[PDB]
Amino acid sequence: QLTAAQELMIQQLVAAQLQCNKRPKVTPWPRDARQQRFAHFTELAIISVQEIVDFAKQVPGFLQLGREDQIALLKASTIEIMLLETARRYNHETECITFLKDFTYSKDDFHRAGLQVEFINPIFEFSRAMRRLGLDDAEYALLIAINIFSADRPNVQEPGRVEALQQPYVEALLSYTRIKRPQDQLRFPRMLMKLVSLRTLSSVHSEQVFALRLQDKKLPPLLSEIWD
Amino acid sequence: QLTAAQELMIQQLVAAQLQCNKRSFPKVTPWPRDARQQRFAHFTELAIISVQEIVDFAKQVPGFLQLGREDQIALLKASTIEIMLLETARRYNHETECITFLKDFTYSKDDFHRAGLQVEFINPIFEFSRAMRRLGLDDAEYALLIAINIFSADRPNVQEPGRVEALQQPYVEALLSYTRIKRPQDQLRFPRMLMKLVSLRTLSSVHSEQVFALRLQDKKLPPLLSEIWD
Ligand SMILES: CC(C)(O)c1cn(-c2ccc(-c3cc(F)c(CO)c(S(C)(=O)=O)c3)cc2F)c(C(C)(C)c2c(Cl)cccc2Cl)n1
Ligand SMILES: CC(C)(O)c1cn(-c2ccc(-c3cc(F)c(CO)c(S(C)(=O)=O)c3)cc2F)c(C(C)(C)c2c(Cl)cccc2Cl)n1
């Protein structure tokens, strides 16, 4: 059963998301060009951040939070929301990512703005895994809102309230996926599991030079010892 | 209605969870500068046992021994910390607000902070422990969530991710059913468990930001603990 409350809420989510996108002054897509490209992407991100602020203000429940927690929520989730939105715009065929519905970008374009391959591959890796899933726009809208309302982000002063406001969007995703693919039942938990790997991706962008990890291939000798 | 096949998967989890623990009940350097250092040395010892227990447990998890060694190790290295947080949660008592390590060893927030460990890490643990406690999990539910956690394909250095994700499927599915049979009317309780694997991702990476803390005591981390942890 989609409740009338749900069915209206998802319409508001999807319309809020559309009304974001259709809202050019950006340095045109082309040393100078590799900088032009880099600044191109910088401005792509800048607009992205503002979209995500405007989407959020329209998520029932959001503007009811304390202003501090609103900000704390958006700080923490911007890069996860950017990632999810990019997966949303990933075209699996052309193997390309479409920004401002129109401009198309492949690995190579990103490498050529001088970008960290070590982070472009994860991006792409994420987009393809999301593709398998077959999300629609309601599903991403809903996944985003759930992602906005994470009680565990730093500087949340009212986590229990954040956590109560999350629940509406967890129920609606739960019902939407039960109606959409009723013979599956693991598509719901699989979507939510991407929020897990999505948190690890995110923490890699912001990694501190004093807390860099990555061991690579080679096995831990001492753990292997313990193993047999 | 939990299938017979899942019940048995679950019995196997709960039984290994129990063989795990029963193993060790001590030789851990006794609880009391010297004061601080002997406390952290104690916890350091507790962490080493926990590693043995986690390795012993994951061995007994259906399907684990079927992965390649490389992958087996990779998976363990990356989850050790999350499993340790998940098992600290389970050992958390919200009336006394204490964590029970081993059997009957009892620790409060201030025990840990008195070992030189920092608020930035210890508090989130106790916040996370408290949150888990409101979930009301029983042992199967933990054993299952730990297995789901072990089977995470997106781990650093994993060569058969498809094989590990597929292994993760029967554990999610068994959790789903186990939760709907246990609170047939609280259908958000399951998502709320899954969201916790998310939280733990973050806790794990808050842990990796502790090196200044450890790199400055000038007595070294046991080497197992050194690699498991960096
Ligand atoms: C240049 C710099 C600072 O390194 C840099 C810049 N961006 C960057 C950030 C966000 C967007 C982006 C994400 C979106 F969801 C949307 C949709 O609202 C849009 S857009 C054009 O308004 O349609 C733009 C594009 C980017 F290129 C990045 C990173 C974060 C790597 C990045 C990159 Cl490339 C692609 C995809 C995701 C991410 Cl998150 N890095
Ligand atoms: C001081 C040092 C060496 O840096 C350090 C050490 N530990 C530490 C790590 C694991 C365990 C622990 C976890 C378990 F799941 C279990 C049960 O298997 C047990 S036990 C005694 O076998 O019952 C012991 C206890 C600890 F004290 C920690 C941190 C990681 C903060 C820590 C602390 Cl305190 C409590 C809870 C989680 C975490 Cl992860 N840090």
Side-chain angles (χ1 to χ4, degrees), chain B residues 69-218:
Chain B
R69 219 191 180 232
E70 302 96 345
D71 273 3
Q72 277 176 225
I73 284 135
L75 282 186
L76 234 46
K77 177 160 197 181
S79 56
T80 286
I81 185 63
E82 298 173 41
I83 289 164
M84 276 159 165
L85 301 150
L86 240 7
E87 258 300 290
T88 307
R90 188 190 159 242
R91 292 165 176 266
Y92 175 67
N93 133 60
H94 208 255
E95 280 132 28
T96 85
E97 309 182 316
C98 295
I99 296 156
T100 299
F101 290 136
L102 289 184
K103 206 81 302 299
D104 74 41
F105 288 174
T106 214
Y107 306 91
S108 66
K109 189 179 268 168
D110 273 59
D111 287 322
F112 293 95
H113 273 269
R114 264 56 246 279
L117 271 343
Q118 310 289 141
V119 158
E120 302 108 81
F121 189 39
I122 279 160
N123 269 23
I125 290 177
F126 283 87
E127 301 146 51
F128 170 82
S129 304
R130 286 192 232 119
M132 284 299 298
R133 120 86 217 343
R134 300 180 204 122
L135 280 170
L137 274 58
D138 67 26
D139 296 342
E141 257 170 341
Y142 272 116
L144 251 357
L145 214 54
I146 294 188
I148 301 169
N149 186 268
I150 295 169
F151 302 118
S152 329
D154 68 310
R155 288 319 179 176
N157 304 140
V158 146
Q159 287 125 105
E160 306 220 74
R163 281 191 66 216
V164 358
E165 183 176 17
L167 255 346
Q168 189 189 61
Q169 113 141 44
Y171 294 98
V172 185
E173 201 167 328
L175 231 195
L176 220 194
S177 320
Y178 185 92
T179 46
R180 68 202 287 165
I181 268 137
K182 187 182 158 170
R183 303 279 170 248
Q185 243 106 134
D186 191 5
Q187 271 203 277
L188 267 16
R189 198 193 151 241
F190 179 58
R192 249 143 62 210
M193 291 174 90
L194 258 33
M195 283 334 178
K196 247 61 174 218
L197 299 182
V198 178
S199 293
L200 223 33
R201 254 351 144 85
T202 301
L203 270 179
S204 140
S205 84
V206 161
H207 189 259
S208 78
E209 299 176 352
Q210 175 161 54
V211 279
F212 280 131
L214 312 165
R215 297 239 228 239
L216 277 159
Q217 276 156 197
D218 85 27

